[PDB]
Design a protein around this ligand. Structure first.
Ligand SMILES: [Ag+]
Ligand SMILES: [Ag+]
Ligand SMILES: [Ag+]
Ligand SMILES: [Ag+]
Lengths: 106, 106
């Protein structure tokens, strides 16, 4: 199952697909940590984007994010195969802002 | 079956996959024409590339290309799914150079 660990100094964000990523409805779980400590009650946004291509417009999907105790479930529908750019935006409960990027080659 | 017609002024290049494109060995058939006339005995090169991006280093494959009577068969191995950029370079028998580009989602 697809997973990437994103590192930005003291910020680590593991993002893992729940099951294998598919065309259709997808669930990913993100575990953002600062010096290994879970970021709870954070604003977590996850965007999946495909640039414009022959026969299709640029596509942007914002995931629906829910938290349980520092684990964030990001639900999205990926309507087609191909490369999706993944952008993770985090505002901690303390107000610090972080961004991290990866990619999903579906 | 994936299929596209690339138009570049007086150049047209029809390209069609053999079967559905997916990870592994892939075959494409290319039919280049200049003002409707088949381009025979040309040098046809086809590059498949996934650009460098967050979480994936750049990947590049050059297809093995053969001609029979103006039809060019391009064989390549695409080791992962996702979006592949397709670049077609043609040097006609007369010495004219052409370049056309598209992409396909695996
Ligand atoms: Ag798309
Ligand atoms: Ag696409
Ligand atoms: Ag790749
Ligand atoms: Ag990629």
């Amino acid at each position: 199952p697809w997973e990437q660990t994103l590192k930005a100094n003291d910020l680590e964000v593991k993002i893992k697909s729940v099951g294998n990523p598919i065309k259709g409805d997808n669930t990913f779980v993100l575990s953002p940590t600062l010096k290994g400590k879970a970021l709870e009650k954070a604003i977590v946004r996850v965007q999946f984007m495909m640039p414009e291509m022959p026969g299709m417009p640029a596509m942007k999907e914002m995931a629906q994010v829910s938290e349980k105790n520092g684990l964030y479930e990001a639900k999205t529908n990926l309507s087609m195969n191909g490369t999706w750019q993944v952008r993770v935006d985090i505002k901690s409960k303390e107000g610090e802002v972080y961004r991290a990027k990866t990619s999903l080659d579906l």
